[model samples]
Target chain A: GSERQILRLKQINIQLATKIQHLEFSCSEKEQEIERLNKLLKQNGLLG
Target chain B: GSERQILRLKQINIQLATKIQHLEFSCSEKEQEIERLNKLLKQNGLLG
Candidate 1:
């Protein structure tokens, strides 16, 4: 029945949510890293 | 009906995929920016 398909889709939805969360956390970390580097370059008179 | 649920789930799946793609693209751009900034710092003898 389509119930199985619905269940599978629900599972996939959860999986996608998990992946999205992980990616968002990683993106946030990378942004922080970028900011840190920018600060260093500015401190060294290499960035505006 | 279950069909309606399935259709809604499918739509959500597509939306999630799109979001994932956008996030991944943004992550890649941030990584490149980080590298560019790192290179600048190194050129100025501010980064190892």
Candidate 2:
């Protein structure tokens, strides 16, 4: 009972941690892309 | 032994799930913002 529960929770924790890491990486990349695009817009006089 | 381990694992799973949700939300917002910026860049003829 407890053993199975513990195993399931541990598996869930691993999956969640992996998902969090992937999302964090994706977010970082997206932010950098946003920054780059904004810089281009500013260079073109579209942004202040 | 198993009881304590199960309790700890469950707590960790809860925390990880919460973290995953927050990160997912953050990533989605960042992606949308990135898309907006990219659209502006394209409108300005700086992007394809």
Candidate 3:
């Protein structure tokens, strides 16, 4: 009974946290891509 | 009790969909940023 409760807690929150973390990591990758493109533009005097 | 199960299903999946939508939008915005920069470089004869 208590063990089911434990898994209920772990299963819900843990999977949610894992997915949020992974998506955050993907967002950071997109941010890096933007940053890299900005740098390339600045290097070529295409950006202010 | 049945409502609780519905909430569980939503809590497990709806938030993930929302977050992914947000990240996907962010990715598209960043992609637009790159496209704009690339266009600028092209107009300036700095890109092929």
lDDT of 1 by residue, B1-48 (tens): 999999999999988888899899999999999889878877887755
lDDT of 2 by residue, B14-46 (tens): 888888899888988988898888777777777
- Models 1 onward score TM values of 0.92, 0.88, 0.59
TM-score for the A chain of candidate 3 = 0.70
Order of models, best TM-score first: 1, 2, 3
In candidate 2 the C-alpha lDDT for residue B21 amounts to: 90
Docking quality tier of model 1: medium
Q: Provide DockQ values for all models, in the order shown.
A: 0.78, 0.79, 0.25
Worst 10 residues of 1 chain A by lDDT: A39-48
Please identify model 3 stretches exceeding 4 Å from their true place: A1-27, B1-5
* Higher-DockQ candidate of 1 and 3: 1
lDDT for A4 in candidate 2 is 81
Best by lDDT: 1
Report clash pairs, candidate 1: none
Better-scoring candidate (TM-score), 2 or 3: 2
Isolated chain A TM-score, each model: 0.89, 0.87, 0.70
Candidate 1 B-chain TM-score: 0.92
